[PDB]
Amino acid sequence: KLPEAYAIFDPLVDVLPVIPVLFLALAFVWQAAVGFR
Amino acid sequence: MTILFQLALAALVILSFVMVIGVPVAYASPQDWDRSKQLIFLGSGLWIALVLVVGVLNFFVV
Amino acid sequence: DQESSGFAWWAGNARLINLSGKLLGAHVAHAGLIVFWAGAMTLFELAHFIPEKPMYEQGLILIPHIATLGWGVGPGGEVVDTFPFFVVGVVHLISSAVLGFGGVYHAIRGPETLEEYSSFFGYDWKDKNKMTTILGFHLIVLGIGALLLVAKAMFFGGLYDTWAPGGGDVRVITNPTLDPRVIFGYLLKSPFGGEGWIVSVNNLEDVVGGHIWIGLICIAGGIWHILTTPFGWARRAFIWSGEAYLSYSLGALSMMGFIATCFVWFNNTVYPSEFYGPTGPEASQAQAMTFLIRDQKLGANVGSAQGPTGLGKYLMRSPTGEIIFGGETMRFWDFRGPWLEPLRGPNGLDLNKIKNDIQPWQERRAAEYMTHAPLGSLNSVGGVATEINSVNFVSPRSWLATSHFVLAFFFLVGHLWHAGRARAAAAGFEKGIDRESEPVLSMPSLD
Amino acid sequence: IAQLTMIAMIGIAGPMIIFLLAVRRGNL
Amino acid sequence: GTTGERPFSDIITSVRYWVIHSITIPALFIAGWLFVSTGLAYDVFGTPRPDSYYAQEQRSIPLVTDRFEAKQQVETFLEQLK
Amino acid sequence: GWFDILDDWLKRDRFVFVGWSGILLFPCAYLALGGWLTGTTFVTSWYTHGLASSYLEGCNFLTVAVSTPANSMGHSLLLLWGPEAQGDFTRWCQLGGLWTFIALHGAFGLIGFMLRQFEIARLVGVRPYNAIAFSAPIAVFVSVFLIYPLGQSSWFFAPSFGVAAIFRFLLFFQGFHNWTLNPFHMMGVAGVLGGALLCAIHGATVENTLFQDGEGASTFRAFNPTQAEETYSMVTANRFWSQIFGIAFSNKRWLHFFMLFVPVTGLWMSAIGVVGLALNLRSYDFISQEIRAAEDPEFETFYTKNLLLNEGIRAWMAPQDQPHENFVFPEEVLPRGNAL
Amino acid sequence: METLKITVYIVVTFFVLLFVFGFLSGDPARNPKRK
Amino acid sequence: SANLWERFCNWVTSTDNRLYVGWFGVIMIPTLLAATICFVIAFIAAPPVDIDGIREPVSGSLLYGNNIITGAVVPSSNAIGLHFYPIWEAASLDEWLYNGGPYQLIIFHFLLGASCYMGRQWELSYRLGMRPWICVAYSAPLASAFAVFLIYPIGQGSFSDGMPLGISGTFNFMIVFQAEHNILMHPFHQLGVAGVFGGALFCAMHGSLVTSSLIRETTETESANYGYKFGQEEETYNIVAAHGYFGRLIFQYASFNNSRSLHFFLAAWPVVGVWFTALGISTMAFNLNGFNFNHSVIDAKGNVINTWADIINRANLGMEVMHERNAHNFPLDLA
Amino acid sequence: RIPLWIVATVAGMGVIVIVGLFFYGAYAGLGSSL
Ligand code: CLA
Ligand code: CLA
Ligand code: CLA
Ligand code: CLA
Ligand code: CLA
Ligand SMILES: CC1=C(/C=C/C(C)=C/C=C/C(C)=C/C=C/C=C(C)/C=C/C=C(C)/C=C/C2=C(C)CCCC2(C)C)C(C)(C)CCC1
Ligand SMILES: CC1=C(\C=C/C(C)=C/C=C/C(C)=C/C=C/C=C(C)/C=C/C=C(C)/C=C/C2=C(C)CCCC2(C)C)C(C)(C)CCC1
Ligand SMILES: [Cl-]
Ligand SMILES: [Fe+2]
């Protein structure tokens, strides 16, 4: 498991992996905002 | 040392969160990034030290 | 700057084909996502990692990659120190921010083009020299990397050798096979049953050795390209454009994607069954082992046992005469593995060793691998499609192999697609047939 | 226990860094 | 290219809409939730609760075996504390 | 006259065209879709098949379904107010009344919908080849969800409305009817598979034989919504295929009619095959094969192999697939190969 | 039988050469316009 | 002679050939002729093949008691596995026909040629000045043959596990597959039937809409087809009347008015769907099978409450328990 | 007036949330196996 100290961040690291996907998503938020040019 | 470690490490997280939302809107709206080129620089510089703080400081807690 | 009067929205990234600067941001921001993943995932894996439990039973695919390089493990793949895992994970995670910075910068602040803001970095797709040169730079960076492995193995610690004399363990390779006849021999090996081509590497000497050759040969070509231009044919053969170059690299990854799929599925050496799961053939072999072992203890003479078809319940012969395990497992008689080798003789499985040299660690090894074959469902339910819920497991070898075949495939389509466009782009009709000069209309009727 | 707290913020973070740009109107 | 109806786009954007639907949408939601969470749904559809498939001992199924006296037969199945 | 005023209103060009047909379509179509969505989440199949079949019980989008009524019900229409349910709603649900509900309602909904096509076509003044085509899907629904079970013992053997609940319908037909070996089913697949080819091939042929009518790469905008010239080189397409396949179209009117024929004829054939499976008049075996297999123990074809697979399917499934038969098959009677 | 192997091998080499020396022969050139 | 080879290359690549023998063709034409000729001879006169390597020959040729529906070309022996088995690897033909030699000669040559056939579908498009990508549509059906004839065998460890070359032989491949992988319960397969059903659907959709909105130019007693001449300038149907009807069937914005966007969809749907189905067989070739919801929903006491998912499992066990009667010697089927 | 692109990305996450709750429910509910 995560080294004793960082344990408080266990929950945090639990979500980190999924982040990359968000970027692919974000690109769509953007285009929508800029009214699909 | 321990709390001192949890401070640096936790602050390093909030700085990143702020830095991550910062740098974009910064280069984004050219309403400056000259006055913010100052803010961003301090954010970038600070960050590095922080990582190095958490770095060396890790070997004392864990 | 760039909008609909460039490309359509859903083809947005193609508007960057001619904006060197911004097109660099992409590659630097992207390369961040890969580092980000690698790092963020390692920490995710470790966060769930349970030391006293097989890695393959925990859905790991990165920690076992580190383990192979001799890190945090010891005898038989026993996990000693989880620090190297944590390190590799956090280090990457950090560097992702650094790269990500540059990415974001070059794509929204910095020069939108490079050519003027520095002629050294700026480039021209058709500039056969700049291309062969940048390519030359990367051919060196990759070359040093290939040596970065050779170093870790020979000097900095070693790698996990499952074939370890005393039984699987971290070993320092200090005798890399450098004999070209052997090294390059692999490339001349058949890709079918038995002779397995590259995937047939079965010892670290060749691995380390082969990497030495690649490291050099690569940097050698790295310099050659810095100091040259494509010849004559090299120019009258290929298409020189931003897309065409992409395509070439697409088919390249595709091919490597297929090769990787077969490596993780078949190879035992560079993919230790101790960290990943047992290979497909290894598990089916293990069943034969297990039951030949069992029934023999019940007083059965394995050597002369006749099964339903009259072929040999436990032991039979391969098409070339060697003694192999019986049953449907006759198809995997090409399997070699630490646990099973000491039973093999000069003619295949020796009836005497099998009769009294079977060791306990082998019986439970066979049992272990038998009950952990790479069979499972999407929802992660280990076993045959007809099995019951209880054992939540799907071999890492199954995950890797499938994911990478899908990727490899689509990339071959990607290849075709970008290669087909480049050829039409070049010659100039990738946007429709010229209403006026319609080529077909100038050709004689075949009727 | 409920690290959904995390996701939530880093989730609204993405649209935010472009929303603030719709306010400060510029460079989208 | 048009008909009487007010262009969805306008409506999905009108602050009036949300002022209405911020109330209406969650309302329906919380309703349906309660429909399940209050066990009402189970009775509206005769659907067995996790503890109502078999009687404690019995391991047989309450298969309806005849059309006309089915309803009557079904009721009897609920009898054995099923 | 009110009639013409009633008409007037209906045939008014709205967002969602109503029409006379709509008076039949919308009521049913909505009830059909509704009943499914209802049962899918709330009603059970315990008292009917001894199966959990709704979200409320724990089933997921794949395992959920509106299961058929008991075998006891027979071919009963199972009306809410009929002898079975007796006006009671809850009972109705537990006796699988929602099946005949969805079935019969949806059935009329398909009549209405085709009528709609017919009605809307007339108004817009176009030919009704959209209606002719839609006869194929009707035939399928009619033959499979009605004609088939009408030939069997009861509605219980009709396909239950659900994803997984349909997969067993497939497996059943294999195991019991050896449906894959049926000439009509084959034609069926030949049409659907071959129809999904024409779709793909024609689409690709068009997109890559287009004229240039714009200066952009994304040639989509470059299209003239108001006819005129052909948007793609029909002449180039012809030469292409004529050299790569040897055969090629050259009459868009025929090429397009062909695209209607192939998948519609296919579905029709697949229907007839099932209409025969109702009476169990299947295409199970080849007599010449069985006779040689009896006398000669070394004769083995991929056909004989398959029949054994069927034997296993029937023996191992029948117990929990046909509860009303109270089947009890001792372990020793269960056909099995070696080891497995 | 050892012959057949040889023959086949030759035959396959022929066509495979014809193929490589083919696209090599300035294939991009071969097309309607730009070349 | 302008230069023999220079001419040769001009002929091969010539767009004036009745059939465009391309560069890819130079590999295609021979490989496909070997495959077909070997097939036709096999299917008609080949002798029994010990497919399962257990000395239990399965005859699948006409002359040996089979008919079109049952007959097939049987896969190479399981004793051979993934080993290369060319004619020159056998003491005699007699041995080669017994170990299912023809099968490999066929699958390898076909897959090879069928690939070049794609490569050609590009080449001619190039030589004619038309956009490429047609070959990319054909990449889906090809990627299936590959998945069914090569990927699955590599994955499963033997060519004896590849789909046989025959009607009934194919049904065997399916029934068994389902038992060992539960394909019907796999996302990729479902997307596959979606693409195929959808395809046929849309194929009927387009087909009908268009043919029904044709501009009149024909007599009452004259084929409506004649109202079109090969090499027309303007369109032969009212795509605006078509859209007008279909737009009213459902609702306007849910209807195509752009022939180009229509035809892309028409091609995109099936190809994408079949691409996934091909990835399904290629993924389940590494034992990553369909969803296993066996004994999922259980009651308050622990009793197992069956779902349709379970009824499917019984049907699957029957296939499992009965396939390859004499081929298994041990408990688990790991091959 | 509420900007469309926001109506979507909000209604969007809102769906990923509910559909994700379903996916969680598959490892806890009655549809579990435990
Ligand atoms: C893909 C990699 C890459 C490339 C090709 C470039 C290229 C460029 N960047 Mg740059 N950049 C990158 C990544 C990259 N960057 C990253 C990750 C960041 C974030 C930190 C930045 C941040 C950045 C800024 C802030 C700026 C540039 C600028 C520039 C341009 C001017 C060149 C210059 O800065 O000289 C720099 C001088 C060097 C040649 C010395 C670099 C030597 C370093 C210290 C060692 C690197 C070690 C390396 C990783 C290992 C390789 C060794 C191996 C071969 C053995 C140039 C086009 C400038 C620009 O916009 O001007 C137009 C500018 O202001 N970049
Ligand atoms: C691998 C992912 C990726 C990357 C790296 C890029 C990169 C890029 N795209 Mg892009 N794109 C992508 C995916 C990606 N795209 C996808 C999936 C689509 C389809 C939806 C598009 C569609 C698309 C279009 C249609 C266009 C681009 C354009 C561009 C370029 C200009 C960027 C821009 O317009 O800023 C806009 C700036 C903003 C509105 C701010 C965005 C927020 C930033 C970038 C994210 C911050 C990251 C992180 C949160 C902060 C880290 C800070 C920390 C390090 C301290 C740029 C090189 C444009 C172009 O052609 O160049 C002129 C363009 O027109 N893209
Ligand atoms: C491609 C490389 C790869 C591989 C081989 C794995 C492998 C694995 N991951 Mg993983 N992962 C990856 C990338 C990869 N990951 C990435 C990029 C991320 C960031 C999002 C994650 C995030 C992640 C998490 C958060 C977790 C894993 C876990 C796991 C393990 C359990 C597998 C699982 O349960 O699958 C189940 C997943 C599926 C069934 C989803 C299939 C999705 C397919 C690809 C969608 C295809 C649809 C298609 C694209 C639609 C397009 C068509 C349209 C355009 C028309 C397994 C070892 C788990 C673990 O470690 O626990 C033990 C775990 O918790 N991974
Ligand atoms: C991966 C990085 C890389 C890349 C992208 C290139 C790219 C290129 N190199 Mg190159 N090169 C590299 C690494 C690389 N090189 C290295 C490491 C070396 C040192 C060994 C060289 C040495 C080198 C030389 C000496 C030359 C090039 C040349 C060229 C150019 C033309 C090559 C060509 O026409 O091939 C097409 C080749 C064919 C027509 C022959 C195809 C037959 C192949 C080899 C066998 C069949 C492949 C098969 C499918 C794979 C199976 C595996 C096999 C082992 C069994 C091209 C730009 C040429 C040039 O133009 O110089 C500037 C040239 O003369 N390179
Ligand atoms: C107009 C569209 C429509 C149609 C065609 C149907 C059709 C049907 N519904 Mg239905 N239904 C509809 C709308 C429609 N529904 C709506 C909107 C609802 C929601 C309120 C329902 C709710 C509903 C339920 C709850 C049920 C049905 C059922 C049924 C079926 C059997 C009912 C029956 O026996 O009718 C009988 C036919 C008539 C009453 C028509 C009579 C017309 C004549 C001309 C009038 C004569 C009257 C006069 C008094 C007679 C004098 C004779 C004298 C000797 C006494 C049938 C297929 C049942 C079913 O599905 O069972 C499986 C069922 O339980 N429906
Ligand atoms: C926090 C943190 C961190 C990190 C961070 C990051 C880096 C982040 C990123 C983030 C992101 C990056 C996010 C994103 C998100 C996104 C989203 C959430 C999206 C959504 C979208 C949508 C929902 C869509 C919609 C739509 C539709 C559906 C239709 C069409 C149109 C549109 C597109 C609109 C760190 C590590 C430092 C540490 C810890 C803390
Ligand atoms: C261009 C563009 C784009 C893209 C972008 C990108 C791609 C980006 C990237 C980015 C990135 C790539 C980022 C990164 C970040 C990172 C970070 C920020 C980091 C952090 C870290 C940390 C924080 C550390 C540490 C730790 C540890 C050590 C343990 C405990 C926990 C923690 C985590 C704390 C888009 C599409 C949007 C749109 C268009 C434009
Ligand atoms: Cl069989
Ligand atoms: Fe068309």
Side-chain angles (χ1 to χ4, degrees), chain F residues 13 116 130 239 242 252-253 300 338, chain H residues 15 18 215 235 245 249 325 328:
Chain F
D13 199 57
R116 157 191 279 262
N130 172 266
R239 195 194 181 75
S242 291
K252 307 175 69 173
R253 287 193 169 189
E300 168 160 48
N338 193 64
Chain H
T15 72
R18 180 60 191 66
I215 312 167
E235 186 45 64
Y245 161 77
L249 194 57
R325 290 160 291 161
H328 305 67

PDB file of all heavy atoms in Angstrom, chain F residues 13 116 130 239 242 252-253 300 338, chain H residues 15 18 215 235 245 249 325 328:
ATOM      1  N   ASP F  13     -49.351  19.879 -40.621  1.00  0.00           N
ATOM      2  CA  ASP F  13     -47.910  19.677 -40.573  1.00  0.00           C
ATOM      3  C   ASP F  13     -47.291  20.205 -39.285  1.00  0.00           C
ATOM      4  O   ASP F  13     -46.965  21.386 -39.183  1.00  0.00           O
ATOM      5  CB  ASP F  13     -47.244  20.327 -41.785  1.00  0.00           C
ATOM      6  CG  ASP F  13     -45.858  19.783 -42.038  1.00  0.00           C
ATOM      7  OD1 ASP F  13     -45.728  18.554 -42.218  1.00  0.00           O
ATOM      8  OD2 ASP F  13     -44.900  20.583 -42.057  1.00  0.00           O
ATOM      9  N   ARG F 116     -49.197   4.706 -41.284  1.00  0.00           N
ATOM     10  CA  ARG F 116     -48.622   6.047 -41.268  1.00  0.00           C
ATOM     11  C   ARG F 116     -47.805   6.279 -42.533  1.00  0.00           C
ATOM     12  O   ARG F 116     -48.069   7.229 -43.275  1.00  0.00           O
ATOM     13  CB  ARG F 116     -47.732   6.244 -40.042  1.00  0.00           C
ATOM     14  CG  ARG F 116     -46.698   7.352 -40.215  1.00  0.00           C
ATOM     15  CD  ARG F 116     -45.667   7.358 -39.102  1.00  0.00           C
ATOM     16  NE  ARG F 116     -46.182   8.019 -37.912  1.00  0.00           N
ATOM     17  CZ  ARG F 116     -45.919   9.282 -37.605  1.00  0.00           C
ATOM     18  NH1 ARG F 116     -45.149  10.007 -38.402  1.00  0.00           N
ATOM     19  NH2 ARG F 116     -46.418   9.819 -36.505  1.00  0.00           N
ATOM     20  N   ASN F 130     -41.563   2.492 -49.137  1.00  0.00           N
ATOM     21  CA  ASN F 130     -41.078   2.481 -47.769  1.00  0.00           C
ATOM     22  C   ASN F 130     -42.016   1.590 -46.976  1.00  0.00           C
ATOM     23  O   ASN F 130     -41.647   1.021 -45.947  1.00  0.00           O
ATOM     24  CB  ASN F 130     -41.098   3.895 -47.195  1.00  0.00           C
ATOM     25  CG  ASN F 130     -40.800   3.926 -45.712  1.00  0.00           C
ATOM     26  OD1 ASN F 130     -41.709   3.916 -44.884  1.00  0.00           O
ATOM     27  ND2 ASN F 130     -39.523   3.980 -45.369  1.00  0.00           N
ATOM     28  N   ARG F 239     -16.579   1.884 -63.631  1.00  0.00           N
ATOM     29  CA  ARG F 239     -15.284   1.399 -64.109  1.00  0.00           C
ATOM     30  C   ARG F 239     -14.455   0.776 -62.997  1.00  0.00           C
ATOM     31  O   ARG F 239     -13.736  -0.196 -63.228  1.00  0.00           O
ATOM     32  CB  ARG F 239     -14.474   2.513 -64.777  1.00  0.00           C
ATOM     33  CG  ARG F 239     -13.298   1.972 -65.587  1.00  0.00           C
ATOM     34  CD  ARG F 239     -12.298   3.051 -65.969  1.00  0.00           C
ATOM     35  NE  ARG F 239     -11.199   2.514 -66.770  1.00  0.00           N
ATOM     36  CZ  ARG F 239     -11.298   2.171 -68.051  1.00  0.00           C
ATOM     37  NH1 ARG F 239     -12.447   2.307 -68.698  1.00  0.00           N
ATOM     38  NH2 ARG F 239     -10.240   1.687 -68.686  1.00  0.00           N
ATOM     39  N   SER F 242     -15.917  -2.627 -62.095  1.00  0.00           N
ATOM     40  CA  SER F 242     -15.799  -3.415 -63.321  1.00  0.00           C
ATOM     41  C   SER F 242     -14.387  -3.964 -63.522  1.00  0.00           C
ATOM     42  O   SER F 242     -14.177  -4.879 -64.319  1.00  0.00           O
ATOM     43  CB  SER F 242     -16.201  -2.586 -64.543  1.00  0.00           C
ATOM     44  OG  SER F 242     -17.592  -2.314 -64.547  1.00  0.00           O
ATOM     45  N   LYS F 252     -28.438   3.515 -61.273  1.00  0.00           N
ATOM     46  CA  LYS F 252     -28.823   3.897 -59.904  1.00  0.00           C
ATOM     47  C   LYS F 252     -30.244   3.504 -59.492  1.00  0.00           C
ATOM     48  O   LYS F 252     -30.505   3.226 -58.322  1.00  0.00           O
ATOM     49  CB  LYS F 252     -28.666   5.410 -59.727  1.00  0.00           C
ATOM     50  CG  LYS F 252     -27.302   5.947 -60.103  1.00  0.00           C
ATOM     51  CD  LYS F 252     -27.269   7.460 -60.028  1.00  0.00           C
ATOM     52  CE  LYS F 252     -27.359   7.939 -58.592  1.00  0.00           C
ATOM     53  NZ  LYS F 252     -27.165   9.408 -58.487  1.00  0.00           N
ATOM     54  N   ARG F 253     -31.154   3.487 -60.461  1.00  0.00           N
ATOM     55  CA  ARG F 253     -32.538   3.113 -60.212  1.00  0.00           C
ATOM     56  C   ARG F 253     -32.614   1.632 -59.850  1.00  0.00           C
ATOM     57  O   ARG F 253     -33.380   1.236 -58.973  1.00  0.00           O
ATOM     58  CB  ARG F 253     -33.415   3.449 -61.419  1.00  0.00           C
ATOM     59  CG  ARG F 253     -33.666   4.942 -61.561  1.00  0.00           C
ATOM     60  CD  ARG F 253     -34.770   5.266 -62.550  1.00  0.00           C
ATOM     61  NE  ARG F 253     -35.151   6.673 -62.459  1.00  0.00           N
ATOM     62  CZ  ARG F 253     -36.203   7.210 -63.065  1.00  0.00           C
ATOM     63  NH1 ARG F 253     -37.009   6.457 -63.801  1.00  0.00           N
ATOM     64  NH2 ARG F 253     -36.459   8.503 -62.921  1.00  0.00           N
ATOM     65  N   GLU F 300     -18.115 -40.021 -39.911  1.00  0.00           N
ATOM     66  CA  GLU F 300     -18.312 -38.803 -39.130  1.00  0.00           C
ATOM     67  C   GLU F 300     -18.179 -37.522 -39.949  1.00  0.00           C
ATOM     68  O   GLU F 300     -17.147 -37.273 -40.575  1.00  0.00           O
ATOM     69  CB  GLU F 300     -17.335 -38.768 -37.953  1.00  0.00           C
ATOM     70  CG  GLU F 300     -17.254 -37.423 -37.251  1.00  0.00           C
ATOM     71  CD  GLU F 300     -16.687 -37.538 -35.850  1.00  0.00           C
ATOM     72  OE1 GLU F 300     -15.642 -38.202 -35.685  1.00  0.00           O
ATOM     73  OE2 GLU F 300     -17.286 -36.971 -34.912  1.00  0.00           O
ATOM     74  N   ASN F 338     -15.994 -37.496 -22.522  1.00  0.00           N
ATOM     75  CA  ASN F 338     -15.040 -37.935 -21.517  1.00  0.00           C
ATOM     76  C   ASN F 338     -14.542 -36.733 -20.720  1.00  0.00           C
ATOM     77  O   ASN F 338     -14.509 -35.613 -21.232  1.00  0.00           O
ATOM     78  CB  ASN F 338     -13.859 -38.636 -22.183  1.00  0.00           C
ATOM     79  CG  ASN F 338     -12.990 -39.382 -21.190  1.00  0.00           C
ATOM     80  OD1 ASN F 338     -13.437 -40.336 -20.553  1.00  0.00           O
ATOM     81  ND2 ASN F 338     -11.742 -38.948 -21.047  1.00  0.00           N
TER      82      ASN F 338
ATOM     83  N   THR H  15      -4.486   0.869 -66.740  1.00  0.00           N
ATOM     84  CA  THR H  15      -5.880   1.025 -66.365  1.00  0.00           C
ATOM     85  C   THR H  15      -6.774   0.686 -67.546  1.00  0.00           C
ATOM     86  O   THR H  15      -7.969   0.977 -67.537  1.00  0.00           O
ATOM     87  CB  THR H  15      -6.181   2.467 -65.957  1.00  0.00           C
ATOM     88  OG1 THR H  15      -6.167   3.293 -67.127  1.00  0.00           O
ATOM     89  CG2 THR H  15      -5.131   2.975 -64.979  1.00  0.00           C
ATOM     90  N   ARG H  18      -9.163  -5.157 -68.731  1.00  0.00           N
ATOM     91  CA  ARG H  18     -10.526  -5.548 -68.371  1.00  0.00           C
ATOM     92  C   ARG H  18     -10.643  -5.756 -66.861  1.00  0.00           C
ATOM     93  O   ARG H  18     -11.602  -5.312 -66.230  1.00  0.00           O
ATOM     94  CB  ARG H  18     -10.909  -6.832 -69.107  1.00  0.00           C
ATOM     95  CG  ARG H  18     -12.314  -7.313 -68.801  1.00  0.00           C
ATOM     96  CD  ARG H  18     -13.342  -6.262 -69.204  1.00  0.00           C
ATOM     97  NE  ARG H  18     -14.681  -6.562 -68.705  1.00  0.00           N
ATOM     98  CZ  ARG H  18     -15.021  -6.584 -67.419  1.00  0.00           C
ATOM     99  NH1 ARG H  18     -14.127  -6.302 -66.477  1.00  0.00           N
ATOM    100  NH2 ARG H  18     -16.267  -6.870 -67.071  1.00  0.00           N
ATOM    101  N   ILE H 215     -37.946  10.541 -60.189  1.00  0.00           N
ATOM    102  CA  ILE H 215     -38.611  11.453 -61.104  1.00  0.00           C
ATOM    103  C   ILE H 215     -39.182  10.633 -62.246  1.00  0.00           C
ATOM    104  O   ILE H 215     -38.505   9.770 -62.800  1.00  0.00           O
ATOM    105  CB  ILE H 215     -37.629  12.493 -61.667  1.00  0.00           C
ATOM    106  CG1 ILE H 215     -36.797  13.106 -60.538  1.00  0.00           C
ATOM    107  CG2 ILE H 215     -38.382  13.577 -62.417  1.00  0.00           C
ATOM    108  CD1 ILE H 215     -35.603  13.907 -61.014  1.00  0.00           C
ATOM    109  N   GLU H 235     -29.418  14.389 -61.242  1.00  0.00           N
ATOM    110  CA  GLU H 235     -29.862  13.261 -60.427  1.00  0.00           C
ATOM    111  C   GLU H 235     -31.118  12.595 -61.003  1.00  0.00           C
ATOM    112  O   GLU H 235     -31.849  13.199 -61.791  1.00  0.00           O
ATOM    113  CB  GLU H 235     -30.090  13.719 -58.979  1.00  0.00           C
ATOM    114  CG  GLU H 235     -30.411  12.606 -57.992  1.00  0.00           C
ATOM    115  CD  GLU H 235     -29.493  11.411 -58.158  1.00  0.00           C
ATOM    116  OE1 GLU H 235     -28.273  11.560 -57.935  1.00  0.00           O
ATOM    117  OE2 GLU H 235     -29.983  10.326 -58.535  1.00  0.00           O
ATOM    118  N   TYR H 245     -40.593  13.271 -47.048  1.00  0.00           N
ATOM    119  CA  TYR H 245     -41.386  12.158 -46.537  1.00  0.00           C
ATOM    120  C   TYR H 245     -40.803  11.604 -45.239  1.00  0.00           C
ATOM    121  O   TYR H 245     -41.493  11.536 -44.222  1.00  0.00           O
ATOM    122  CB  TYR H 245     -41.452  11.039 -47.580  1.00  0.00           C
ATOM    123  CG  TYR H 245     -41.831   9.694 -47.001  1.00  0.00           C
ATOM    124  CD1 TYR H 245     -43.148   9.407 -46.672  1.00  0.00           C
ATOM    125  CD2 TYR H 245     -40.872   8.712 -46.779  1.00  0.00           C
ATOM    126  CE1 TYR H 245     -43.501   8.182 -46.145  1.00  0.00           C
ATOM    127  CE2 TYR H 245     -41.215   7.485 -46.246  1.00  0.00           C
ATOM    128  CZ  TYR H 245     -42.532   7.226 -45.933  1.00  0.00           C
ATOM    129  OH  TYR H 245     -42.880   6.011 -45.398  1.00  0.00           O
ATOM    130  N   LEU H 249     -42.047  11.155 -41.295  1.00  0.00           N
ATOM    131  CA  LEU H 249     -42.242   9.827 -40.732  1.00  0.00           C
ATOM    132  C   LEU H 249     -41.863   9.867 -39.254  1.00  0.00           C
ATOM    133  O   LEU H 249     -42.635   9.444 -38.392  1.00  0.00           O
ATOM    134  CB  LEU H 249     -41.371   8.809 -41.470  1.00  0.00           C
ATOM    135  CG  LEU H 249     -41.688   7.334 -41.226  1.00  0.00           C
ATOM    136  CD1 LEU H 249     -43.136   7.048 -41.584  1.00  0.00           C
ATOM    137  CD2 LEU H 249     -40.752   6.442 -42.024  1.00  0.00           C
ATOM    138  N   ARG H 325     -16.238 -35.232 -27.788  1.00  0.00           N
ATOM    139  CA  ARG H 325     -16.465 -36.391 -26.927  1.00  0.00           C
ATOM    140  C   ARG H 325     -15.216 -36.991 -26.291  1.00  0.00           C
ATOM    141  O   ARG H 325     -14.999 -36.910 -25.082  1.00  0.00           O
ATOM    142  CB  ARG H 325     -17.084 -37.503 -27.765  1.00  0.00           C
ATOM    143  CG  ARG H 325     -18.498 -37.291 -28.233  1.00  0.00           C
ATOM    144  CD  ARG H 325     -18.690 -38.225 -29.402  1.00  0.00           C
ATOM    145  NE  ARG H 325     -17.884 -37.766 -30.532  1.00  0.00           N
ATOM    146  CZ  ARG H 325     -17.545 -38.524 -31.568  1.00  0.00           C
ATOM    147  NH1 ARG H 325     -17.900 -39.795 -31.600  1.00  0.00           N
ATOM    148  NH2 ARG H 325     -16.818 -38.019 -32.557  1.00  0.00           N
ATOM    149  N   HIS H 328     -11.065 -35.028 -24.450  1.00  0.00           N
ATOM    150  CA  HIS H 328     -10.652 -34.576 -23.125  1.00  0.00           C
ATOM    151  C   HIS H 328     -10.292 -35.717 -22.185  1.00  0.00           C
ATOM    152  O   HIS H 328     -10.967 -36.747 -22.147  1.00  0.00           O
ATOM    153  CB  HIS H 328     -11.731 -33.699 -22.490  1.00  0.00           C
ATOM    154  CG  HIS H 328     -12.127 -32.531 -23.338  1.00  0.00           C
ATOM    155  ND1 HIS H 328     -12.790 -32.668 -24.538  1.00  0.00           N
ATOM    156  CD2 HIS H 328     -11.929 -31.203 -23.168  1.00  0.00           C
ATOM    157  CE1 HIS H 328     -12.998 -31.474 -25.063  1.00  0.00           C
ATOM    158  NE2 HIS H 328     -12.485 -30.567 -24.251  1.00  0.00           N
TER     159      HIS H 328
END
